[PDB]
C-alpha cells in the first residue's frame, strides 16, 4: 500500500573487465588466422577440463565433503545445432568469482607473450597447449565464448567475451551445474562442422585419447 523506490541497486549485474595487453592481442590473432587444423580446440578444452578434474580429485582425497555437490568426475560434450552452440561440461573443481576473472583475464598474459614470440620463431598453433593458454584456441571456431562456473566456496557466475578486448562477469541465474566449468562455445557460422555427431567422435579419438576421465557425447 506504499510507494517503493530502489535507492541503491547493490552490486553491478554485469562487470566489464579488460584483458591484459598480450591476452587480447592473441585472441585477435586466433580469430583472424586461416588455420585449417583448427580441431585442436576440442583437444585443449578437454585437456583443460581434465586439469580441473585432477584438482577436485586431489583435494577430495583429504576431504570427501568437497564432493557433496558432485560425486562423479565426468566430461560432457553437448552439441546444439539449434542455437549453434557446442557445450562442454566438466564436473571439476571449478572457479571462484575472483579466480574466474583472474585466470581467464590476467595470468594468461605470461604464456601468451611466450606463445606469440614462439610464433615469430615458427611455432604452430597446435602447440598452444604447451603454454597453458590453450583455452583461447577455442576462438579458432567460435566468435563468442561463454563460461559457466561453480565452486564449493562461492556462487555461480558467467564469463562472456567476443574478443573485443574486454569480458563481462555476471551472476549466472539459470541451470545449476553443481560444480565445475561449463564452456559454452558460440560457433562461427562456417564451423558447424564440429556440431555433427560423427565429426566430434573422431577428434576425441584422434587427440584426447590420453584423458583419464569419461567423455560422454550427448548427441
From Swiss-Prot:
Post-translational modification here is noted as: Ubiquitinated in the presence of STUB1-UBE2D1 complex (in vitro).
Q: Where ATP is bound, by residue?
A: 48, 90, 109, 135
Query: Where in the cell?
Result: Cytoplasm; Melanosome; Nucleus; Secreted
Q: Where is this region: Interaction with NR3C1?
A: 11-219
Q: Where is this site: Cleaved under oxidative stress?
A: 128-129
Induction context: By heat shock.
Q: Where is this region: Interaction with BIRC2?
A: 4-216
Task: Quote the record's domain comment.
Answer: The TPR repeat-binding motif mediates interaction with TPR repeat-containing proteins.
- Which family would the database say this protein is a member of? Belongs to the heat shock protein 90 family.
Q: What does it do?
A: Molecular chaperone that promotes the maturation, structural maintenance and proper regulation of specific target proteins involved for instance in cell cycle control and signal transduction. Undergoes a functional cycle linked to its ATPase activity. This cycle probably induces conformational changes in the client proteins, thereby causing their activation. Interacts dynamically with various co-chaperones that modulate its substrate recognition, ATPase cycle and chaperone function.
- What quaternary structure, including any partners, is listed in this protein's UniProt entry? Monomer. Homodimer. Forms a complex with CDK6 and CDC37. Interacts with UNC45A; binding to UNC45A involves 2 UNC45A monomers per HSP90AB1 dimer. Interacts with CHORDC1. Interacts with DNAJC7. Interacts with FKBP4. May interact with NWD1. Interacts with SGTA. Interacts with HSF1 in an ATP-dependent manner. Interacts with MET; the interaction suppresses MET kinase activity. Interacts with ERBB2 in an ATP-dependent manner; the interaction suppresses ERBB2 kinase activity. Interacts with HIF1A, KEAP1 and RHOBTB2. Interacts with STUB1 and SMAD3. Interacts with XPO1 and AHSA1. Interacts with BIRC2. (Microbial infection) Protein on the cell surface interacts with N.meningitidis serogroup B adhesin A (nadA).
Q: What is this protein called?
A: Heat shock protein HSP 90-beta
